[PDB]
Every structure is written in structure tokens, then in C-alpha cells.
């Protein structure tokens with residue numbers, strides 16, 4: 001682990017303007033940010049970008065996004081969020097990460113943290 | 126009434142960094158903003174200031190802040206919060222069952238008085 005999302009706070013709904021808070025640990029430093037957006041996850045990514053921009057890290061483009069649940073159904077069902085990223089700033093450098101969580105918003109966050117660590121991972125050798 | 130706070134939502138607590146959203150109406154246009162702060166009301170003022178600067182209006186300095194309740198009040202008690210602004214000193218009061226909302230009322234009253242000096 002090179003980057004850890006210590007905590008996040010996501011808020012939306014009919015009547016609410018989507019906004020989110022982020023707390024991440026990268027290179028011994030803790031970064032805290034807020035932002036609004038068109039949706040909960042979107043606001044989160046906007047907040048991330050502020051930290052990300054300051055660090056000279058560019059986030060891979062979101063190419064596809066899919067959320068599924070294992071058989072059995074439920075309102076409290078665990079969520080599989082698949083996100084397709086393109087590493088290239090353009091060209092094809094496509095790859096996928098996943099999150100599993102009771103909360104789907106958190107699952108997308110998980111899948112983003114996995115993406116971040118894959119791209120900031122020191123060379124395997 | 127020249128300015129209206131159409132809506133706001135303030136969120137704070139232990140483990141939470143204070144932040145607020147503001148939606149205000151002024152001269153036909155609606156302005157929406159967000160901001161963090163040291164406290165809920167403080168986060169609200171930071172957000173308000175962002176709009177305030179855009180519109181070219183300067184907010185008076187907070188000289189004092191007092192929150193009181195009428196006799197025998199439970200936890201659901203109505204709150205009278207009076208804020209004094211800056212001689213050039215004046216006060217605004219808000220009354221509401223929610224204490225942070227009563228400070229928003231007091232700030233809204235100040236904004237309307239400051240934009241209409243003739244009272």
C-alpha cells in the first residue's frame with residue numbers, strides 16, 4: 001500500500017447537492033479535501049482531483065463503470081463495482097479494478113483506491 | 126427583504142470535518158456554494174463569503190456571539206442567538222429550535238440590513 005484513503009464522507013439525494021470529503025495518506029502526508037459534483041461518486045472524484053492535481057498525478061480516464069450483485073438479491077446485498085480505466089493520456093492503455101462493499105458508493109471508492117495503488121506502485125523488478 | 130438564504134445544510138461532529146452548503150437568492154440569481162471550517166457556522170460563513178466576494182459585498186466583523194434559551198427549556202428548546210456586528214456596532218437575533226439555523230437567520234437579517242442601511 002502506497003496510498004490509503006483513511007476516510008471519506010459522501011452525501012446526496014433529492015434536494016441535496018452532491019458533495020464529498022476525502023482523507024488520504026500518501027508519502028507520509030495526510031491530505032484532506034472537499035468538493036461538490038453531479039453525483040456522490042463524482043463529487044468524491046472531484047475532491048480527489050484537488051489532492052491529485054497538487055501532487056502532479058493525473059487520474060486515468062473512467063472508460064466504463066458497472067455495478068452488480070451476487071445471486072440472492074437483497075437491499076443489503078454486497079456490491080461488485082467494476083471500473084474500466086485508461087492509463088494513457090491519449091491511444092489504448094485500458095485496465096480494470098474492483099471493489100466489494102455493502103455500500104455501493106464505498107465500493108466505487110475501494111475500486112478507485114485499488115486503481116491508485118496499481119498506478120503508484122513502485123516497479124515490481 | 127433583498128437577500129434570501131433559500132437553503133443550507135451544515136454538517137459537523139466528532140470524526141467529521143465541519144462543512145456547509147449555502148443556496149442564496151439575490152437579484153433574481155441563485156448562488157450555491159460549499160466550504161469547510163473550524164465549526165459548522167464558521168464553515169457556513171466561509172461558503173457565504175465566497176458568494177459575498179463575487180457579488181462585491183463586504184461582511185461586517187463578528188464582534189460577539191451569544192446563544193441563550195428561555196426558562197425551563199428541554200433539549201428541544203427554542204434558541205435565541207444574537208450576533209453583534211461591527212463604532213458602527215449593531216446586533217441581529219435569530220430564534221429557532223435549531224441553534225445553527227438561528228445563527229443563519231441572524232446572518233440573513235444582517236445581510237438584509239447591510240444591503241439596506243436605511244433599515
Ligand SMILES: CC[C@H](C)[C@H](N)C(=O)O
Pocket residue numbers: 038039040041042043062065
Ligand atoms: C460513473 C458515474 C458516477 C457513478 C455517477 N455520475 C455518480 O456520481 O453518482
Ligand SMILES: CC[C@H](C)[C@H](N)C(=O)O
Pocket residue numbers: 163164165166167168187190
Ligand atoms: C462564532 C463561533 C461559531 C459559532 C463557531 N466557531 C462555530 O462555527 O461553531
Ligand SMILES: [Zn+2]
Pocket residue numbers: 011136
Ligand atoms: Zn454532508
